[PDB]
């Protein structure tokens, strides 16, 4: 019984920034979601399919993990229909969502003494992302009528902007690790069961 690898997602070392969220696929194995759920060491565990129990006994053809780190006050953005920086320009869910979201505080692990500047989000973007899209483009933003062509300055800003995760910040500002486990069901051998 080759258990599906989840210890290499939730127990990973370096979650990528929210604009370059680490996507992984799970297939051709079995996973015990219930043991992860009943761990209780998770801040939020919100499911938009079925409850943690009954999702074990519904075999699926693929399970996509999407891992990153965001701010506490913006965790409440990660759900279909929400709007904001994350929900528009960094990681947008669809309104037909199946799967669910698992998030927990990682203050100590991810906060530096003076606040780590490793993480980023696309603060500037013309149009919001389509659902599940990715956009890692690092071109300087085109703010208004006049271009500047790669010279960072007025009316054209480097869209990516960092996080000041000081180890003293308010809990709404301390980083939280987030993983979206999106199930999917297709016309194929369902190789992810319980």
């Amino acid at each position, epitope marked *: 019984t080759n258990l599906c690898p989840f210890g290499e997602v939730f127990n990973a070392t370096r979650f990528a920034s929210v604009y370059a969220w680490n996507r992984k696929r799970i297939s051709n194995c079995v996973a015990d979601y219930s043991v992860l759920y009943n761990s209780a060491s998770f801040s939020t565990f919100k499911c938009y399919g079925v409850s943690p129990t009954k999702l074990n006994d519904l075999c699926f053809t693929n399970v996509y993990a999407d891992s990153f780190v965001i701010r506490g006050d913006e965790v409440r953005q990660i759900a279909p229909g929400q709007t904001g920086k994350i929900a528009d320009y960094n990681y947008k869910l669809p309104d037909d969502f199946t799967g669910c979201v698992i998030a927990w505080n990682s203050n100590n692990l991810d906060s530096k003494v003076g606040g780590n500047y490793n993480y980023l989000y696309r*603060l500037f*973007r*013309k*149009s919001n992302l389509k659902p599940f899209e990715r956009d890692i483009s690092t071109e300087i933003y085109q703010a*208004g*009528s006049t271009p500047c062509n790669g010279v960072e300055g007025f*009316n054209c800003y480097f869209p990516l902007q960092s996080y000041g995760f000081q180890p003293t910040n*308010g809990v709404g500002y301390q980083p939280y690790r987030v993983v979206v486990l999106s199930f999917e069901l297709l016309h194929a051998p369902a190789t992810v069961c319980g």
Partner: antibody, heavy 109, light 102 residues
Framework: LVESGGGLVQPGGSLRLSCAAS????????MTWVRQAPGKGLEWVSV???????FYADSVKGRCTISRHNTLYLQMNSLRAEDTAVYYC???????????WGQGTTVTV | QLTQSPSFLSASVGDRVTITCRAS??????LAWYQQKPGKAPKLLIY???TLQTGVPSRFSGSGSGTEFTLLQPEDFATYYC??????????FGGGSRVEIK
């Protein structure tokens, strides 16, 4: 720079205000609406995103922001007592702050 | 959260004054400093710490759950505001100490 709009009207009448860009088009910037009551600090009554999503405050939660091309609009029906104040345009750089503002304009019940 | 700033200050001309605002619990980079001269739309001064274009004589910042700025030139008979940056639903402003010169 920017531009002002209509002034004092009746109570709970269809209040409306407008704004205009000067050298920076309104399709790509976090446009705003900030309100200062006469004899009070500042507020924040609306923000309009580049993608189109809008946000309002607790008070004046029924306000309707808008965007088009470069004639920014804000509207409201329940022009209650708090509506008597001055309002300002501003483009936001959420890490760099409320940048250049309009001249602002006043309205009263 | 809520932000509380100092009261009004009566200062002497050509003297460096200091204003401060303490935040509820933790901001550490998300505070901006603004100038409102009476009858005029307010003008920003300060990012987390940096300064934009003009206030070179009135730039100072020390932000960790309680920030403070330091500004002198007798053309500062106006009011100073602190706006906390990323609280997306409310864009809460400070109590806004005003300075007079004497």
């Amino acid at each position: 720079l920017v531009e002002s709009g209509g002034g004092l009207v009746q109570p709970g009448g269809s209040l409306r205000l407008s704004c205009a860009a000067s050298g920076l088009t309104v399709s790509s910037n976090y446009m705003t609406w900030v309100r200062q009551a006469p004899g009070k600090g500042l507020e924040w009554v609306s923000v309009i995103y580049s993608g189109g999503s809008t946000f309002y405050a607790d008070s004046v939660k029924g306000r309707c922001t808008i965007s088009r091309h470069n004639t920014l609009y804000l509207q409201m029906n329940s022009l209650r007592a708090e509506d008597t104040a001055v309002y300002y345009c501003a483009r936001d750089l959420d890490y760099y702050g409320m940048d250049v503002w309009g001249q602002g304009t006043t309205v009263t019940v | 959260q809520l932000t509380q700033s100092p009261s009004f200050l009566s200062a002497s001309v050509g003297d460096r004054v200091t204003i401060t605002c303490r935040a509820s619990q933790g901001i550490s980079n998300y505070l901006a400093w603004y100038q409102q001269k009476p009858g005029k739309a307010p003008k920003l001064l300060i990012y987390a710490a940096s300064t934009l274009q003009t206030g070179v004589p009135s730039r100072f910042s020390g932000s960790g759950s309680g920030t403070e700025f330091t500004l002198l030139q007798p053309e500062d008979f106006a009011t100073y505001y602190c706006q906390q940056l990323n609280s997306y639903p409310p864009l809460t402003f400070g109590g806004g100490s005003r300075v007079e010169i004497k």
